[PDB]
From Swiss-Prot, chains A, B:
Keywords: Antibiotic resistance, ATP-binding, Cytoplasm, DNA-binding, Isomerase, Nucleotide-binding, Topoisomerase. It comes from Staphylococcus aureus (strain N315). Residues 184-636 form the Topo IIA-type catalytic domain. GO terms for cellular component: chromosome; cytoplasm; DNA topoisomerase type II (double strand cut, ATP-hydrolyzing) complex. A type II topoisomerase that negatively supercoils closed circular double-stranded (ds) DNA in an ATP-dependent manner to modulate DNA topology and maintain chromosomes in an underwound state. Negative supercoiling favors strand separation, and DNA replication, transcription, recombination and repair, all of which involve strand separation. Also able to catalyze the interconversion of other topological isomers of dsDNA rings, including catenanes and knotted rings. Type II topoisomerases break and join 2 DNA strands simultaneously in an ATP-dependent manner. The gene is gyrA. The active site is at 272 (o-(5'-phospho-dna)-tyrosine intermediate). GO terms for biological process: DNA topological change; DNA-templated DNA replication; response to antibiotic. This is DNA gyrase subunit A.
Amino acid sequence: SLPGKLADCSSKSPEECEIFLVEGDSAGGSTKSGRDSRTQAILPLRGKILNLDRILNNNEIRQMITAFGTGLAKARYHKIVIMTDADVDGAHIRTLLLTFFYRFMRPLIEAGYVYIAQPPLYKLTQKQKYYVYNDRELDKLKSESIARYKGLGEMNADQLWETTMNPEHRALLQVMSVIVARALPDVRDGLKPVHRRILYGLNEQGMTPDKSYKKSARIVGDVMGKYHPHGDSSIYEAMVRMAQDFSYRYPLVDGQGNFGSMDGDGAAAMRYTEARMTKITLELLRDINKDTIDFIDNYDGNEREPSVLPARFPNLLANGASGGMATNIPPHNLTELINGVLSLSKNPDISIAELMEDIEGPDFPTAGLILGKSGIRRAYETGRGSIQMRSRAVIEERGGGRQRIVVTEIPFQVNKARMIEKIAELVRDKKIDGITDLRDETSLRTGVRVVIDVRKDANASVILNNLYKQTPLQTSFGVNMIALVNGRPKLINLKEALVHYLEHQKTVVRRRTQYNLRKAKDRAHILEGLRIALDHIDEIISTIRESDTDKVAMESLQQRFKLSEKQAQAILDMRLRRLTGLERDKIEAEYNELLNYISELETILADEEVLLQLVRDELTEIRDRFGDDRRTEIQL
Amino acid sequence: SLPGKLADCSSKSPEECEIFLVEGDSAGGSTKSGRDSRTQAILPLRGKILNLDRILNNNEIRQMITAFGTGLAKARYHKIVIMTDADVDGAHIRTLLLTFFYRFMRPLIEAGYVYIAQPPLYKLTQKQKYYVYNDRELDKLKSESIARYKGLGEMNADQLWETTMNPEHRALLQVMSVIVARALPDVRDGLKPVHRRILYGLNEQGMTPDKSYKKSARIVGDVMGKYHPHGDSSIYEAMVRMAQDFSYRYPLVDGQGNFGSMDGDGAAAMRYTEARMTKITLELLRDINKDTIDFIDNYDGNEREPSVLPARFPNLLANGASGGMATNIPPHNLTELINGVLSLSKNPDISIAELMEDIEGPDFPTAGLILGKSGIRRAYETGRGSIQMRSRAVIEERGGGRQRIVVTEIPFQVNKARMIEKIAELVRDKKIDGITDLRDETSLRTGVRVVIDVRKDANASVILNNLYKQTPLQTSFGVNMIALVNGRPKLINLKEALVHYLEHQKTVVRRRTQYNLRKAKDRAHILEGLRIALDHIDEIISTIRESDTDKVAMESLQQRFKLSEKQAQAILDMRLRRLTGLERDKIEAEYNELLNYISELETILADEEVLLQLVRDELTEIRDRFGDDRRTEIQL
Ligand SMILES: [Ca+2]
């Protein structure tokens, strides 16, 4: 009987009593409310405390035991219900607890004293809503919107009680797609859920590069409330990351203010730093509203969001993807990439070895050196391979025979401070002799500059080679090209990544042509009715002003001038100001051009290669405006 | 020369060198970037570590010393600049550091080695923008929008460098309104910045009680991005608080899901819990868009927000205000309050003693007992007084002479768990004898129920009185009626609080009448032009279709039919569908009523008492629909 932590029941006979183990925040309070305190006692576990990571019993678990009473047939509660959420987090505790019981308290499992809660699963809102517990029941329910309960904290006390812990109605049980899709980038646009939502929220609020910087909170707050309902931290961090010259080969966010550093310096408060779209990002959301990608419902059903972006440049390979680290893809050269894609499109059957005549290999924003084509080959042929990144370092001779190491560029994602802080240790731990001083003079003007002062007697060259060994001054990049292909996580090699990409581009362009074509017809149709309308205006006003209701108006108009439902409507929504003299010709001018446009669009659609070239050209154009010089040197 | 923490410079002569102490997150990275690493070294202090709270030197401060070199004329840097933000937080570190230097390192101050940074203060955007450093310079600037820099993290590296740390241009210095207004409630609506923004964001997104619950994240995310650019935690917590039956006498938020408990149980994730407006909250935002309160610019200038709400019930006193705790106001009875206000309005000169014939005193959502009219009197007469809250407890006799204490209601804001957890200690510490068992069977059906089992030999009554002493089972409420009056924090007594309130109501109602009156005229004017327009339609179409541009159209119309600029405009924006038969009469019908309405509104405005009664009645109506029975008993 823990006083402050556990809620006790009146009954004292273990046969009657039942104890619910719920996650404190998940449903501690509401679970304490809906219960039948005459026979129901609750013990909320402090989720954070519980965290294969075995160790001495937790204060939380120790309490769990005390309350049971066995830790022996002297048990206090015959039934021990485990209430936990459906979510990733929830299954954690459910398993940890179960797993636990087996190891130090199996008799309970043997005795059938531990149960597992079964809350509703679905609520069908069609105010009438439904309480389904499994797909089959749901399938039968719907045949005879949906919203799946994935958190106990979504439910009120009484409902929690009525559906899940009230014996009369309850249905106890004796005794990872979120994790997946939520991390891995789509192979089509390179973005992972948070990033895509972010770039989308930038687009939706029209924070284009041509307009002024908006405060960061203004974007975090929007995305969090509409697409990504989690801590601001996760969104702001991910947004900061896209804005760092040393993190993205092609920053997608344009930040203003303090945005951290290679040393893991933090970024300023979100209400201080400003951010807007990068010009290259516009090529990432280009045509998004021309039915080029399928939209989906947002987490709660009140908004709509892109399953992918048009991604008019090969972003996955370009900017890379980063890691648990289920995947690990490196940045590449946009010019090389686009050139590689153009080479793919000229002939489908091109070899990875030939793709590599365009795509030299990785190309980190941080520059530096790659130590050989070996790991690159393996990584491109299979999707896995270690790649050797070594800093750009030179030694320079000065005064009284003294020497000096100057580190100009460091390996990607290496924390410069921790590296400096490390060499220092190797010197205090006397594992390095010759270093008389080390400074990190890295600034905006000098660029990265770590300076190691070697002494006269020492050998800088030798020391240097010893850093490649004892420090991050050389780091391996473990390629591991995993990405969402066809909704499923897949491992890809170089060619395959581009293939799915180019495919996406052919889909985007065609889908755009179609949208544009059916939007033009729609408008051409509407213009015909307007022309008719305007021409015989006298008539139109006659038949309308004779009509008693807007509905019969619709009727006469279609009847007498042979207008369509849409057309009649448009004429009724015409403003008197459209009656001026110039209008008629603008309507005819817009029409005559629109007809020509419709024609050109049907021409693209009709011919396969015409469309592919359209893709070829648009790609070529972007490469021309955004492509730049390679920074990382592959040597040997 | 701390390696990993401090950024070093090349120069080694203390005369040249200068060290900047900046707040790590504030501007650690951007400060490391803009610097002149040839003579400028930076030491970012880990803000969190630094937190009158004196103690053993911090690891942070210890580093500060090491780097200086004196801690002696053996100093390393002749100049020691302290860069910190303007914000509340910023002045903390600025003072802590200064204060520090005096105590263990005064020679430096004596030597003039410590300076203080002076970043720009204002940026005037009129793309041309300005860099002002003080109001006078600004005043001269504007005479010859504004946005005040209040965070170093708002600035880029190069600007930080150019304006603040570049010696050529820099202007060093040898050697709380936010805190205020940001906590205290406005005496007019009872709300404090976060709450008002929240209720406003509920209104702006139309999350009215008649529509469905929206996920909590959907409100947190909106408010945070538009009005309150801080951690989601602060907003969600404050929103949860407004939704708790045991926290607000009149919940302003209508929550669904897990929302915590008296035991300090947490609320569920914001993406799990649902929330919407409470019906009483509608009386809080009633007429907000009828020019009843002054709007202001939001933190970044892209949005507009209420400096106050209409607050059609006395919310400050009703729901209270809570605490550092600069203020502390208790909940009250809405019926009593409204009655007290009506009593005020019947005669301005009413005494606090008479107000108290309506307003019995505080009235906590948690019920319980108040121990006397004493502290109440003092609190109402002066705005300060201790009030004694005691639980509702009874003893009941059972079996073999055994007794029992049953606690039904506890004092306001007392953490029930911590209280139970406390009594338990008093029993293990053998400071209480007779308690054979204690249980907290509080549920939704049983309500609050703490049960203390006393034994036969013990005296429950005696024990009980010993709890009032040794535990929160009795708690004092320290009244302290401070609130924003006229932009300034002021202490108020009972009468004064209502006075400022009733005043606000007279302002709201009049301001509404005026808005309604000038909006009706506007529309009456527009209707006259439409009538004319429609009547002579043949003409109208003639003169319009003869016009070549919409501008000359405007001209002819005003000229020939003597229409006004607005009127001519409206006729041009008329849709052909408005030409149907029924329209003309609706326009005449709407007009004929509108004229009558305009008349009635001028009647209110004209007469003082007519308006006051309007307030009297509207108040009376709300009291009738929302007023309820008093829960807290004032006894003796
Ligand atoms: Ca947080």
